[PDB]
Design a protein around this ligand. Structure first.
Ligand SMILES: CC(C)=CCC/C(Br)=C/COP(=O)(O)OP(=O)(O)O
Ligand SMILES: [Mg+2]
Ligand SMILES: [Mg+2]
Ligand SMILES: [Mg+2]
Ligand SMILES: [Mg+2]
Ligand SMILES: [Mg+2]
Lengths: 320, 335
């Protein structure tokens, strides 16, 4: 993302806060409105904002050059901030589950994106497709979070649940829909691209990119150079654990059963030692090459009048 | 009405099928979501859902009241019950309550706990899927979507304002003012309990006049305030549900009026004993409420508020039916 893109995007955030905390309306509840301004200011604008900026990039690469006015690029930025409000509601739910922030702040921040959509988009043709997309992505993300939770019982990982089929479903529902599909489908709708076949072709490639993203992330959690990775300690349904269980003989399976998802640092080292023994680094190297090649092929094959450069830009951001 | 109740209840199983049995690659989580809906949504009294059907039947032109349109009103009623189910799942986790209406709180069930947050967000999100299935081709679609999102935002402001009356599990009695109490009841309860069912009935009847919605809101916020004050009164003085508002340190009408009427010695009793777990501390507060004559004060408020609201309903103008607001009044005041 360019300096211009990053700065124009960040310039919108203070307007979003004023919009949601009823600036100019003279509210009967100033103390709780002032608190909500702090909830937004403290939790929404501080990250890398990759999902929000991806919404702007998608719109710029899908729209006709002649329709790329400062006004339309700003609307794309506002949609990007709606994605970042959803991201913030999900990160807040994570902070609450890990332990100023109240439990209902995640519901409140999620609800706030619909107020922003109504303010800026209610008179445009893309309004109902956009609100229906957010509704559907919200429901699917909740299904993904619940599927992830069904891999744990009484504080212990259920290793029988750690299948590649279940892993692929968790990544798709919990992460890929809101992280990869939502920004691109928002860009398409703002560019008045409603063709189901176009949305379907984009979704197919973006779910593939999303799966590589999460597998790379899972690999680096254990084998990256250090934040310090806690997936093993937390008993997470990670690609490493799924492939470990595929490759394990009964003795190796017993090591996973005894030491996976334990608080003792020694147990994390025992699992890392097993991942090394099982050749998960070499397996990841093969997956990375084969997955990159398949995704590059599918992007080159993209039809229905969709631009390739958008998907290559997204892919190159993940693989580098 | 028996017929109205049974008609309404007959819709629920279809809504569960719409949300779980219509994502074929993830059956374990759709089966679980059916159980979340079945536990939290259809048990006990469905007053808000049924009030949506009643409001519609009193707002719509008699000739337009088909079984099909009455069923759409019922589906909107269930969307209100879906919103309520989401709010109470979350509130019970926040307040660490044991039961609601005798049922163990959802978050307390095996292997839920803080996963109740995801279930809250999931149940709330689900009502928009119901709206899309049944209303996407009707003119009322976007107004109804916008009303649900706006009421959710306002209800969250109410819950957060309620929380600003507590610090580290201790009530902040300086926050217990009638103006703060009125604002909590308006945002936290009255919007989703009273405004939402009536505004849904109006939209389904193609009544979009902002002035009509404004006139309805003014009366329904007044009725909503008496409703919660009566509820607060009966928590302490009702004949045994067992009231735990004092133990929980709630910003109740009783606590607010007690602090208004208290001399400095009586204030110190509230400061020492309000929101404490000890049964003797609840007894001390109840005894203070009796000493301060809160029963007589409630009796006077009940009479005066009934007369003021009745006068305000007589003065309602535009097309709004007076009989709807009198019927709601009769249901709350029981006269
Ligand atoms: C946003 C959000 C989660 C709102 C909850 C609204 C409601 Br309704 C909360 C219930 O209110 P309260 O806890 O004061 O009494 P009780 O639990 O019925 O005894
Ligand atoms: Mg990770
Ligand atoms: Mg409660
Ligand atoms: Mg509460
Ligand atoms: Mg009560
Ligand atoms: Mg209670």
């Amino acid at each position: 993302f360019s300096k211009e893109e990053s700065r124009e995007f960040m310039a919108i955030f203070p307007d979003i806060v004023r919009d949601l905390t009823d600036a100019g309306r003279h509210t009967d509840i100033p103390e709780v409105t002032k608190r909500f301004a702090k909830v937004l200011q403290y939790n929404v604008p501080t990250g890398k904002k990759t999902r929000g900026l991806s919404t702007v990039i998608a719109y710029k690469m899908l729209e006709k050059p002649e329709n790329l006015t400062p006004e339309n690029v700003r609307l794309a930025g506002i949609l990007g901030w709606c994605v970042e409000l959803l991201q913030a509601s999900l990160l807040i739910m994570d902070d609450l589950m890990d332990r100023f922030l109240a439990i209902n702040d995640c519901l409140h921040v999620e609800s706030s994106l619909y107020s922003v959509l109504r303010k800026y988009f209610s008179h445009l043709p893309c309004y109902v497709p956009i609100i229906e997309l957010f509704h559907d992505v919200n429901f699917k993300t909740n299904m993904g979070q619940s599927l992830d939770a069904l891999c744990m019982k009484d504080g212990r990982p259920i290793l029988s649940q750690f299948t590649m089929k279940r892993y692929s479903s968790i990544v798709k529902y919990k992460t890929s829909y809101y992280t990869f599909q939502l920004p691109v489908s928002l860009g398409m709708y703002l560019a008045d691209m409603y063709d189901p076949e176009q949305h379907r072709q984009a979704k197919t490639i973006l779910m593939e990119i999303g799966e590589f993203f999460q597998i790379q992330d899972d690999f680096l959690d254990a084998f990256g150079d250090s934040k310090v990775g806690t997936d093993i300690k937390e008993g997470k349904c990670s690609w490493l654990a799924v492939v470990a269980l595929q490759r394990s003989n009964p003795a190796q399976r017993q090591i996973m059963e005894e030491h996976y998802g334990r608080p003792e640092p020694e147990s994390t080292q025992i699992i890392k030692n097993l991942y090394i023994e099982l050749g998960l680094p070499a397996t990841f190297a093969v997956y990375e090459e084969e997955s990159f090649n398949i995704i590059r092929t599918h992007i080159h094959q993209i039809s229905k009048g969709l631009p390739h450069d958008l998907f290559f830009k997204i892919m190159k951001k993940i693989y580098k």
